Design a protein around this ligand. Structure first.
Ligand SMILES: CCCCCCCCCCCCCCCCCC(=O)OC[C@H](COP(=O)(O)OCCN)OC(=O)CCCCCCCCCCCCCCCCC
Ligand SMILES: CCCCCCCCCCCCCCCCCC(=O)OC[C@H](COP(=O)(O)OCCN)OC(=O)CCCCCCCCCCCCCCCCC
Ligand SMILES: CCCCCCCCCCCCCCCCCC(=O)OC[C@H](COP(=O)(O)OCCN)OC(=O)CCCCCCCCCCCCCCCCC
Ligand SMILES: CCCCCCCCCCCCCCCCCC(=O)OC[C@H](COP(=O)(O)OCCN)OC(=O)CCCCCCCCCCCCCCCCC
Ligand SMILES: CCCCCCCCCCCCCCCCCC(=O)OC[C@H](COP(=O)(O)OCCN)OC(=O)CCCCCCCCCCCCCCCCC
Ligand SMILES: CCCCCCCCCCCCCCCCCC(=O)OC[C@H](COP(=O)(O)OCCN)OC(=O)CCCCCCCCCCCCCCCCC
Ligand SMILES: CCCCCCCCCCCC(=O)OC[C@H](COP(=O)(O)OCC[N+](C)(C)C)OC(=O)CCCCCCCCCCC
Ligand SMILES: CCCCCCCCCCCC(=O)OC[C@H](COP(=O)(O)OCC[N+](C)(C)C)OC(=O)CCCCCCCCCCC
Ligand SMILES: CCCCCCCCCCCC(=O)OC[C@H](COP(=O)(O)OCC[N+](C)(C)C)OC(=O)CCCCCCCCCCC
Ligand SMILES: CCCCCCCCCCCC(=O)OC[C@H](COP(=O)(O)OCC[N+](C)(C)C)OC(=O)CCCCCCCCCCC
Ligand SMILES: CCCCCCCCCCCCO[C@H]1O[C@H](CO)[C@@H](O[C@H]2O[C@@H](CO)[C@H](O)[C@H](O)[C@@H]2O)[C@H](O)[C@H]1O
Ligand SMILES: CCCCCCCCCCCCO[C@H]1O[C@H](CO)[C@@H](O[C@H]2O[C@@H](CO)[C@H](O)[C@H](O)[C@@H]2O)[C@H](O)[C@H]1O
Lengths: 92, 469, 26, 67, 179, 89, 486, 81
């Protein structure tokens, strides 16, 4: 026996059956490449002295500064209806 | 019932030609069903976890072992229908999937060795039964001696299983040298604390566990499951793991081992990582069986692990049969046959299967998402119970490794589904041949259980809270 | 003229042409 | 309840027959008697679990009564 | 706490890591493909010796040192030790970013490993199974795993702090009319 | 306790570091089983117990059947290949 | 009568309709409009004078699995609604027919599979709000992944495959740590139900831990910085119903998850770890807005805006104030009206006509496609939060409460009022502006189907923008149940 | 931001970096049982290594456990690098 698929299977092409509409876009070839690049930048991104600057800024320093601000100013201000001379803070 | 089967089949098969082998398989299939129907009432004896010792003190019968016995039979009535009911009555599928004469005898003898292990209460019965399960499965790998790869497989499995039987017997003889006993019931809190038996019992666990593919000795078993025929791979890959894991779960040997924690972590990492680049199906599913062996190893450390084990072993077995069955059905719709024994090897041969048979792919998705642990499929409710037990007993790093291993294993589990729902040219439009009725109904029934068996979880919990408590 | 940001992206272009920018307004 | 359980177990049984017909690439109404056979068979399975659970609930109730 | 002995543990750890390098060297010499001999063990080995020794030295030295500098026993120490180990292993690849990445991520993994208790095993008495659980009975101190229907207010003010809505006495009763 | 451990260890090492053939592997398995039985029978004498000798006789049976099955498997390999080369399994 | 006979009548009618006309979308549209009406009837019969849960039904009980349980021992999945859940329920029944009708003519291969998958996702989302126990929530939280993966992989755009693995793996990752927290709850409390889970006062040290696993999940679903990178891709390559369903409802599930799991329990961990939440929400707002300023794909830009408005809504709900809750909810509602309209405009109008999403081609629609211009500007000014639209009233209230909790962070987050305008108007000006693009030929103006949809999604937000007080009748309890203030 | 963070480090701590990390680790896991020339002696040597490694690892972690940890980090490197 030669091991081959059964001949009772009748096969044919895939016709999704959409109505092929006219050309309402003129592809440009360079815009598409610019988009492919800006879309798959992640697979070519490399670490260097500017990428590192931006990365450490926006993922170390600014988060740490915002957190220092928060965890100092946690329960500090409370000034609903306050009046002259009264302190707006709950701490020193 | 097994014995009268094995005894009768020897005579009845010697009296019978090569042309009756399918009918004889069908007979023993129906016979096992009649056992499982008519003798199943014996679960009443195990009310309130009444436990019985038999043949002296060699065997032990409780609800755990009985359920494992029913499961092994349910596996063995599905694994037999695969040999005794031809899919398509074509010459190709005659040549591809034809049982041999002695195969069924070796299956039942392996069932017997599996059940003597779980039912064992003394190490002597364990050593006799693991040798029975081991020798029967050397021969099952080797019975298809017209293939080169199976010949290589049985030879390696013989040697590397013999080495582990040596390790097991060395451990038993050490336990006897220390304590003058072959019975683990002769242990207790006093004797555990008072004696340095940690080394002497982990050596038992490892000598049993390296026979099921635990890391870093996974490769040899993976080469075997790949190189052997698919309808043998579906049996060898499951039953030995059930038997040995059940024996190690029932006997609360390794309560809080550090070695077992390390190895089980390594299995989850290996079985999740090394199965990503695989292009072959069987190696992919073998690495899947390994990571599931990792998850089930993690409840050897618990001392209350029956429900989580029973639920996971059941859904694992069901999903394992169903996925291999889907792979078997799909052989009709592919373009290239690679072998007389392994018609399908590479995952990229299932391409476009949605355009041929879509409901086969629905079953594949249900089964895949069950492996991953997507609810409301049964795999969720199984991995949930494991997480409950380990977190209730104090393993936290391992739970994170467990989560991570599930995520990593989604990728090699979804490779099948991704290529299956891809598009293909030269689709199927008609075929006057039709697949068998029984195998379709079996596959369907396993699918419907993986899908809807979440409905019965409370009922199962009530029955468990009576018969196991 | 290639500005700072536009020549910090040199290692990443791969095959893309490293054009010299000129704003259209000029 | 019993009757609700049996209709549901029959509903799983029709799903097995239907899914089996589709896996064979047949129409859903190929062999209607298979729907009836799958219904009664799974209905028996759900019935068995119904009686098992009833016996177990009675047992725990009996444990409380002898208390 | 009780301080650590940095040099005693570091010398033991280095001899151990040297021994592990010897074992892995011999195992590679046996498992490898091409013609080899008893000479190749320390020549053709991919730095298994320096890998193991530098890691064990750096890990144990940093853990004991920062346990003694912080003067505590906790997970932050294992984080620093995994940070050193990642530096050592990542120095092998002669790149800055991979060195930084190996450091941070090996440190986070060891730091998690110290968070969960610095063990792959379990305590088995701090666990939920072997410990008191459920509802505490009568006003007793609420342990970790125990549940409580009504909590004290002094304990809340201490654990959390005052302000941001949370106070020593409620707002109405504080501003009730003495009438 | 000594002689058995020594035969067992040396035969495991000669099983593991055999770059030559396969009959050495069969032999090392049989010698490992021998050394086990000697360990066990020494302990059974010192304890004046019988369970050791029972497990020993059982090992003899099981080892002989092991060699029978192994030497049928080898014959299958040889059926197909015609030569059992030094580095084939 | 028999319950089984009624649904057998329905299934039979469905089989005959399927056999005569080989399509289902008419029956599904009928069922969708039926569900909308039946939910409206439930609102008519819903008492607003009760904080209790109404229309309780239990499923999958031991005694009556395939029916409902009237037992004295409840071991199954619970269901029922408060006014919070009813709100998003009304949002979901309102959107499902439109998500089908936004794809009534452009799906031409295996259509019936698509409309099945859409309705299954929409029904599963609907039932998730009825959920009254942690486990039923979770098993309906994770049930949309297989359908979303399949839907995206088949009916998706070019890069569908990468998008489908991203929606699965990211959401599964966050969900699994949610499962760990739920499992720790379940082995401790030995009960999971959204009725009496606030009574149990766990120790603080354990709330500090359970919170981390719940919040890891909610970071991954909402999303939030720095796990905001799946959403742009999954929206970019998804079919139109996938994008509408996602932005409208699945991101609102994260907010419902906070209010229903994380606040009534874990109160003390919220009041201790809130400042870290404010850090994360603030970074989400500004960085995603600035990342939006330099994108090229239309659909990705709308996606980034969804991240921003959710991050404002997190400032409000996590603010320990009534106005914060009522704003964060109204943001979720108005967002689930506005964003689907924009995803329809950029995914089922322009992509249908010209089959490309790059801004560089698009310019000068106002000349030949004026009505599309009018809708773009209205929805753009509703997205950014022009008043008399719910996306302002919710912005204002959440920033009231965020300012109350931490005034600095709640005021530095007011720049969202600007940055939303930047990344939306830089685009709207391009589309409606200039001379018609040479690359694009002409095509029809918007058809009545799409005009129907956009006019519904605008009337609804204008209503809640003009009188938000209508939604208070369901929420006047919910604004105070989840406030931990002594 | 959009390039160096949203499409840079935040894809590296995610899809891109995990993909490369798993590419290598899987290619080093499977390139471990190197020679197919004889699958027997190799798996046999793997038994001997594992038994010896566990006996020695347990020896170290009896006397001190904070020393075996780097041994395991490095082993994971050797197995996955
Ligand atoms: C089968 C093939 C035939 C060949 C057989 C060869 C002989 C077999 C040797 C024994 C059996 C193999 C054992 C396999 C390894 C696994 C051993 C094991 O895991 O036991 C560990 C166990 C403690 O682990 P656990 O119970 O999990 O945790 C609680 C800890 N308190 O228990 C222990 O704590 C272990 C006890 C610690 C002492 C270990 C002894 C090591 C001594 C070696 C010193 C070498 C000298 C220095 C180096 C020399 C090189 C120059
Ligand atoms: C009663 C179950 C329904 C049934 O009888 O199935 C019949 C089938 C159509 O059969 P029909 O076309 O009318 O007759 C064939 C002519 N040779 O109709 C079908 O195809 C049934 C398919 C739906 C079954 C789904 C499972 C129902 C579960 C309900 C609980
Ligand atoms: C002699 C003097 C003694 C002095 C006293 C102190 C001695 C202490 C010795 C410590 C033990 C050292 C053992 C070193 C490991 C064995 C060496 C080795 O090479 O292992 C890998 C081995 C061969 O691999 P190789 O040939 O190098 O090819 C590499 C390409 N991948 O291939 C293998 O398959 C064998 C693997 C063996 C693994 C053993 C079990 C390790 C368990 C893994 C730990 C995981 C736990 C951490 C998980 C964290 C999760 C993130
Ligand atoms: C603060 C957060 C900062 C984020 C740090 C992430 C840096 C990183 O991962 O570095 C990537 C580095 C490859 O860097 P690169 O040279 O640019 O790319 C190779 C192409 N030639 O490759 C590496 O860093 C490799 C590090 C591998 C360590 C994995 C950790 C084990 C996980 C368990
Ligand atoms: C939880 C379980 C996850 C379920 C995921 C659904 C996966 C379905 C993907 C495969 C598929 O094609 O679905 C089968 C579908 C019919 O597919 P269809 O487009 O109509 O092709 C021709 C029909 N003979 O049949 C269906 O309608 C199934 C819809 C569900
Ligand atoms: C008791 C303490 C135990 C606790 C555990 C401690 C962890 C120790 C981990 C060390 C064990 C060895 C595993 C190291 C990873 C193996 C591969 C590797 O070395 O990483 C390098 C890889 C290279 O990337 P590239 O430079 O582009 O490719 C050229 C490489 N020559 O790098 C990359 O691909 C880029 C990396 C980018 C960063 C990705 C960060 C992902 C973090 C989540 C990881 C989750 C998956 C964990 C996988 C486990 C694998 C073991
Ligand atoms: C048992 C055959 C297994 C073969 C595989 C088929 C699954 C059957 C599961 C019934 C178990 C039982 O009903 O039992 C419940 C058992 C203990 O009860 P028991 O002592 O064994 O008595 C049973 C007496 N029977 C045999 C006469 C009925 O609790 C467990 O931990 C089982 C956990 C199994 C989880 C798998 C759920 C699958 C959904 C099943 C939908 C019908
Ligand atoms: C015990 C099982 C009871 C029968 C059952 O419940 O299963 C019902 C199914 C019926 O399947 P069918 O498609 O109608 O067979 C079609 C056969 N014709 C075409 C000849 C009519 O039986 C089986 O096929 C295998 C049962 C396993
Ligand atoms: C407050 C709730 C909404 C109130 C109702 C507003 C919608 C009424 C329908 C307007 C139709 C129209 O304006 O025409 C649409 C105009 C057409 O321009 P044209 O004059 O007809 O000449 C045609 C010459 N073309 C073809 C060259 C243009 O498209 C545009 O140029 C884009 C401008 C949109 C103006 C939006 C009106 C102000 C509403 C802003 C409130 C947020
Ligand atoms: C954070 C989660 C994450 O980052 O998950 C994103 C990635 C997805 O990987 P991928 O790119 O889609 O794989 C490529 C698959 N293709 C090629 C078939 C499309 O998950 C992982 O790698 C594994 C998750 C590890 C969890 C820690
Ligand atoms: C650009 C990439 C490179 C930068 C990466 C930045 C990632 C952050 C790494 C630095 C981590 C330093 O983390 C540091 O914080 C902890 C507390 O938070 C300090 O440890 C402190 O913990 C507190 C508890 O919170 C203790 O009670 C004690 O007071 C101690 O001083 C440790 O000294 C150190 O572990
Ligand atoms: C991401 C979420 C899921 C991640 C998985 C982890 C979740 C499980 C929680 C880990 C709990 C660890 O908790 C462990 O430490 C706590 C202290 O904090 C200990 O709690 C004990 O601490 C001692 C002090 O040492 C005090 O007396 C305290 O009253 C209590 O008895 C317990 O011995 C143990 O329960």
């Amino acid at each position: 026996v030669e091991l081959k698929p059964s001949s009772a299977i009748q096969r044919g092409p895939l016709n999704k059956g959409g109505w092929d509409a006219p050309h309402a876009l003129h592809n440009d070839g360079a815009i598409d490449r610019y988009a492919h690049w800006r879309t798959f930048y992640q697979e070519r991104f490399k670490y260097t002295r500017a990428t590192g600057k931006s990365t450490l800024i926006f993922l170390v320093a600014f988060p740490a500064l915002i957190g220092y601000v928060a965890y100092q100013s946690e329960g500090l201000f409370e000034f609903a209806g306050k009046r002259r001379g009264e302190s707006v803070t709950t701490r020193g | 019932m097994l014995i009268l089967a094995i005894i009768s089949l020897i005579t009845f098969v010697s009296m019978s030609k090569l042309s009756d082998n399918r009918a004889i398989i069908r007979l023993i299939n129906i016979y096992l069903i009649l056992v499982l129907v008519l003798d199943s009432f014996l679960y009443l004896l195990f009310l309130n976890n009444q436990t019985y010792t038999v043949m002296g003190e060699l065997l032990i019968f409780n609800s755990f072992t009985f359920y494992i016995d029913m499961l092994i039979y349910f596996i063995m009535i599905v694994i037999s229908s695969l040999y005794g009911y031809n899919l398509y009555n074509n010459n190709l599928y005659k040549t591809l999937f034809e049982p041999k004469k002695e195969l069924i005898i070796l299956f039942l003898i392996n069932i017997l060795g599996a059940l003597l292990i779980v039912h064992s209460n003394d190490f002597i019965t364990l050593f006799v039964a693991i040798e029975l399960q081991s020798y029967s499965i050397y021969l099952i790998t080797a019975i298809y001696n017209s293939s080169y790869k199976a010949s290589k497989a049985s030879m390696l499995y013989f040697f590397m299983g013999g080495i582990l039987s040596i390790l097991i017997a060395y451990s038993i003889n050490t336990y006897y040298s220390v304590l003058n006993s072959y019975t683990l019931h002769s242990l207790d809190s006093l004797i555990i604390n008072t004696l340095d038996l940690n080394l002497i019992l982990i050596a038992l666990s490892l000598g049993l566990l390296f026979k099921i593919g635990i890391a870093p000795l996974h490769k040899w078993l993976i080469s075997i499951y790949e190189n052997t025929p698919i309808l043998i791979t579906i049996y060898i890959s499951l039953i030995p793991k059930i038997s040995i894991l059940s024996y190690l779960v029932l006997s609360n040997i390794s309560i809080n081992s550090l070695v077992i924690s390390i190895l089980a972590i390594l299995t989850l990492l290996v079985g999740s990582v090394g199965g990503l680049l695989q292009i072959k199906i069987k190696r992919l599913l073998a690495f899947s069986g390994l990571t599931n062996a990792g998850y089930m190893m993690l409840l050897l450390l618990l001392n209350n692990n029956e429900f989580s084990y029973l639920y996971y072993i059941t859904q694992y077995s069901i999903s394992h049969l169903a996925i291999f069955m889907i792979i078997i059905f799909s052989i009709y719709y592919i373009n290239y046959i690679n072998n007389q024994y392994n018609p399908i090897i590479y995952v990229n041969q299932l391409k476009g299967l949605i355009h041929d048979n879509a409901y086969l792919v629905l079953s594949m998705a249900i089964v895949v998402f069950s492996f991953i642990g997507i609810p409301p499929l049964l795999g969720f409710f199984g991995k949930l119970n494991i997480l409950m037990s380990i977190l209730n007993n104090g393993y936290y790093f391992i739970s994170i490794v467990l989560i991570v291993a599930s995520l990593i294993s989604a990728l090699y589990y979804l490779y099948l589904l991704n290529v299956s729902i891809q598009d293909k040219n030269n689709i199927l439009i008609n075929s006057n041949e039709t697949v068998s009725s029984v195998l379709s109904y079996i596959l369907s029934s396993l699918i419907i259980l993986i899908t809807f068996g979440f409905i019965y979880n409370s009922l199962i919990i009530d029955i468990f809270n009576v018969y196991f408590n | 003229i290639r500005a700072s940001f536009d020549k910090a992206e040199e290692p990443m272009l791969g095959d893309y042409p490293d054009i010299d920018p000129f704003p259209a307004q000029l | 309840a019993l009757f609700t359980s049996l209709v549901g177990a029959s509903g799983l049984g029709f799903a097995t027959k239907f899914l089996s017909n589709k896996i064979r690439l047949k129409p859903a109404g190929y062999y209607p008697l298979g729907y009836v056979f799958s219904g009664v068979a799974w209905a028996g399975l759900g019935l068995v679990l119904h009686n098992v659970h009833q016996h177990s609930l009675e047992v725990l109730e009996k444990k409380k009564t002898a208390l | 706490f009780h301080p650590y002995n940095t040099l005693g543990l570091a010398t033991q750890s280095a001899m151990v890591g040297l021994g592990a390098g010897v074992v892995a060297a011999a195992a590679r010499n046996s498992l490898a493909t091409g013609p080899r001999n008893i000479l190749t063990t320390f020549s053709k080995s991919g730095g298994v010796v320096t890998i193991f020794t530098g890691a064990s030295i750096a890990y144990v030295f940093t853990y004991c040192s920062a346990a003694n500098l912080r003067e505590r026993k906790d997970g932050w120490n294992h984080m620093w030790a995994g940070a050193a180990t990642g530096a050592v292993l990542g120095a092998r690849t002669k790149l800055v970013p991979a060195f930084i990445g190996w450091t941070v991520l090996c440190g986070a993994a060891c730091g998690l490993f110290g968070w969960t208790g610095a063990r792959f095993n379990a305590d088995r008495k701090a666990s939920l199974e072997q410990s008191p659980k459920g509802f505490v009975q009568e006003d007793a101190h609420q342990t970790f795993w125990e549940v409580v229907h009504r909590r004290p207010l002094s304990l809340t003010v201490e654990q959390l702090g005052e302000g941001r809505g949370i106070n020593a006495v409620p707002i109405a009763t504080a501003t009730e009319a003495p009438n | 306790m000594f002689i058995g451990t020594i035969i067992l260890v040396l035969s495991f090492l000669g099983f593991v570091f055999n770059r030559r053939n396969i009959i050495l592997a069969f032999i090392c398995l049989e010698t490992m089983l021998l050394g086990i039985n000697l360990i066990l029978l020494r302990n059974s004498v010192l304890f004046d117990d019988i369970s050791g000798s029972l497990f020993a006789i059982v090992i003899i049976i099981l080892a002989g059947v092991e060699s029978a099955i192994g030497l049928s498997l080898l014959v299958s390999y040889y059926r197909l290949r015609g030569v059992i080369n030094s580095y084939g399994i | 009568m028999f319950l089984t006979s009624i649904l057998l009548s329905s299934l039979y009618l469905f089989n005959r309709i399927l056999a005569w006309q080989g399509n289902v979308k008419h029956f599904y549209l009928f069922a969708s409009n039926l569900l909308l009406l039946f939910i409206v009837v439930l609102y008519i019969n819903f008492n607003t004078f009760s904080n209790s849960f109404q229309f309780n039904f239990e499923l999958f009980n031991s005694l009556n699995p395939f029916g409902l349980s009237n037992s004295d021992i409840s071991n199954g999945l619970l269901f029922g609604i408060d006014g919070l859940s009813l709100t998003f329920i009304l949002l979901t029944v309102l959107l499902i027919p439109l998500t089908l009708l936004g794809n009534w003519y452009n799906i031409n291969f295996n259509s019936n599979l698509y409309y099945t998958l859409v309705l299954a996702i929409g029904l599963v989302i609907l039932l998730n709000f009825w959920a009254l126990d942690y486990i039923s929530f979770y098993i309906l939280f994770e049930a949309t992944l297989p359908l979303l993966f399949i839907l995206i992989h088949i009916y998706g755009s070019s890069d569908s495959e990468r998008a489908s693995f991203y929606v699965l793996m990211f959401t599964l990752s966050g969900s699994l740590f949610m499962l760990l927290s739920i499992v720790v709850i379940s082995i401790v409390l030995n009960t999971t139900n959204f009725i009496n889970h606030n009574l149990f006062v766990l120790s603080l040290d354990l709330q500090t831990i359970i919170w981390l696993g719940l919040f890891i999940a909610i970071m991954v679903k909402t999303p939030l910085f720095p796990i905001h990178v799946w959403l742009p891709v999954v929206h970019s390559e998804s079919p139109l119903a996938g994008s509408m369903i996602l932005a409208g409802l699945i991101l609102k599930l994260a907010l419902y998850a906070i209010l229903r799991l994380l606040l009534p329990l874990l109160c003390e961990a919220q009041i201790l770890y809130t400042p870290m939440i404010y850090i994360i929400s603030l970074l989400t707002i500004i960085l995603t807005s600035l990342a939006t300023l330099r994108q090229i794909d239309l659909k990705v830009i709308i996606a980034y805006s969804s991240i921003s408005h959710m991050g404002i809504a997190i400032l409000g709900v996590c603010s320990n104030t009534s106005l914060g809750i009522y704003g964060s909810i109204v943001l979720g509602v108005a967002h689930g009206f506005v964003s689907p309209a924009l995803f329809l405009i950029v995914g089922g109008i322009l992509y249908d006509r010209y089959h490309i999403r790059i801004v560089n081609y698009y310019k000068g629609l106002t000349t030949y496609m004026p009505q599309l211009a009018t809708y773009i500007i209205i929805l753009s000014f509703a997205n950014i939060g022009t008043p008399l639209t719910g996306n302002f009233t919710g912005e204002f209230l959440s920033l009231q409460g965020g300012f109350i909790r931490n005034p600095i962070i709640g005021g530095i987050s007011c720049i969202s009022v600007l940055l939303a305008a930047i990344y939306q108007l830089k685009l709207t000006n391009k589309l409606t502006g200039g001379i018609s693009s040479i690359y694009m030929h002409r095509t029809n103006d918007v058809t009545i189907r799409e005009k129907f949809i956009m006019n519904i999604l605008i009337i609804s937000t204008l209503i809640i923008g003009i009188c938000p007080q209508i939604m208070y009748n369901l929420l006047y309890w919910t604004v105070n149940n989840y406030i931990y203030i002594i | 931001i959009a390039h160096h963070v949203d499409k840079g480090s935040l894809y590296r701590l995610g899809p891109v970096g995990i993909n490369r990390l798993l590419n290598k680790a899987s290619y080093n896991v499977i390139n471990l049982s190197s020679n197919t020339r004889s699958s027997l002696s190799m798996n046999s040597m793997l038994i001997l290594i594992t038994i010896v490694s566990l006996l020695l690892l347990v020896l170290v972690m009896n006397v001190n456990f904070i020393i075996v940890i780097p041994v395991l980090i490095s082993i994971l490197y050797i197995l996955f690098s």
